[PDB]
């Protein structure tokens, strides 16, 4: 259990962070604030040639480097903090639920499989509204199950989808999507094998580019 605990301040359930904030709720507030600002900037970046694991990590670094020392690094790789301790978390399972995220070697395997799919589908270009929304839901569910980071997966994955939409000719807009709406879609897909809420979600947030 040792490696996993090194993500957290001794005795707390709070992730080590660059603010040195020990209060979990204050960390949440400060992090969110910084991520929203960095997200505004990242929306202006030109699309990458390849939508791959490296790009997801670039997104994660861009959103979270002010918050976490390990921003951009996935939880299957050992990370050594400035404080000298080393953390890793190959297995994560949402509390109170049976189905885990990708475990250990599965994280890389799943990301590689998603890379191949996107390359084969030419990054979802040349698709109608309906076709893009359908395929984008599948991509997002794959990202969500992979859950490659210790924290910040939702925000990195959602930005990945915004940028994919930008490249593909579709605006993907999460601005009116509550935490509850998103959580319900994610849980139904991953815990219960029901993709309809996620399909509906991507239909609701996908629009022609203006
Ligand atoms: N029981 C669950 N099963 C599957 N996915 C879940 C479950 N609970 C939460 N999730 C999803 O896990 C993601 C959150 O991962 P996390 O590493 O906490 O990302 P985050 O960016 O830090 N937080 P957030 O802004 O709320 O998405 C969200 O997409 C949730 O909908």
* Ligand 1 pocket, residues with Cβ under 6 angstroms: 94, 97, 144, 151-155, 179, 182-183, 186-187, 190-191
- A 10 A CB-CB count for 114 gives 21
Q: Whole-angstrom Cα distance, residue 175 to residue 180?
A: 13
Name the residue of 15, 107, 144 whose CB sits within 8 Å of the most ligand 1 atoms, as the mutation to test its pocket: 144
For residue 112, which of 60, 137, 76 has the smallest C-alpha distance? 76
- Is 202 exposed, middle or buried (CB count within 10 Å of its CB: 0-12, 13-18, 19+)? buried
- Overall resolution, Å: 1.7
85 alpha carbon – ligand 1 mean position (Å):
26
Distance of CA 125 to the CA centre of its chain: 22
- Considering only CA atoms, which residue is closest to atom 30 of ligand 1? 183
Token pair, residue 125, equals 């270009």
Report the nearest-CA residue for atom 20 of ligand 1.
Answer: 152
Q: What does each C-alpha distance from 66 to 71, 140, 208 come to in angstroms?
A: 8, 25, 33
The residues near 168 (Cβ < 8 Å, ≥ 6 apart) are 123, 124, 125, 127, 132
Nearest-CA residue for ligand 1 atom 22 is 152
Q: How many other CB atoms are there within 10 angstroms of residue 161's CB atom? A: 21
Residue written as tokens 């297995």?
A: 91
Q: Could you tell me which residues are beta bridge partners of residue 208?
A: 170
Ligand 1 pocket test: which of 31, 98, 186 has the largest number of ligand atoms within 8 Å of its C-beta? Answer: 186
Q: What is the DSSP string of 87-128?
A: E--S----TT-S-----THHHHHHHHHHHHHHHHTGGG-S--
- DSSP track, 118-186: HHHTGGG-S--HHHHHHHHHHHHHHHHHH--SSS-HHHHHHHHHHHHHHHHTEEE--TT--HHHHHHHH
Domain boundaries, the chain: 1-210
CA end-to-end span of the chain: 50
Using CA atoms, how far apart are residues 168 and 45, in angstroms rounded to an integer?
15
65 and 156 Cβ atoms separated by less than 8 Å: no
Q: In the chain, which residues are last before a break of more than 2.5 Å from C to the next N?
A: none
What is the CATH topology of the domain spanning 1-210? Answer: Fic-like fold (1.10.3290)
Q: Whole-angstrom Cα distance, residue 88 to residue 199?
A: 33
Residues 6+ apart with CB under 8 A from 86: 3, 6, 78, 79, 80
């Amino acid at each position: 259990h040792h490696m996993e605990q090194n993500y957290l301040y001794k005795g707390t359930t709070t992730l080590k962070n660059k603010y040195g904030i020990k209060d979990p709720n204050k960390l949440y507030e400060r992090c969110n604030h910084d991520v929203v600002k960095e997200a505004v900037n990242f929306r202006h970046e030109p699309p990458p040639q390849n939508f791959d694991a490296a790009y997801l990590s670039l997104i994660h670094w861009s959103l979270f480097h002010k918050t976490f020392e390990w921003a951009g690094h996935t939880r299957d790789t050992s990370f050594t903090f400035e404080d000298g301790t080393t953390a890793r978390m190959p297995a994560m399972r949402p509390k109170g639920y049976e189905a885990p995220f990708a475990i250990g070697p599965q994280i890389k395997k799943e990301l590689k499989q998603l890379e191949k799919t996107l390359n084969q589908k030419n990054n979802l270009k040349g698709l109608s509204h309906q076709e893009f929304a359908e395929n984008a839901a599948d991509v997002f569910m794959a990202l969500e199950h992979a859950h490659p980071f210790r924290k910040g997966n939702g925000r990195a994955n959602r930005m990945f989808m915004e940028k994919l939409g930008q490249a593909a000719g579709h605006t993907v807009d999460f601005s009116f999507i509550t935490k509850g709406r998103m959580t319900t879609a994610c849980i139904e897909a991953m815990q219960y094998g029901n993709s309809q809420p996620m399909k509906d979600l991507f239909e609701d947030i996908t629009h022609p580019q203006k």
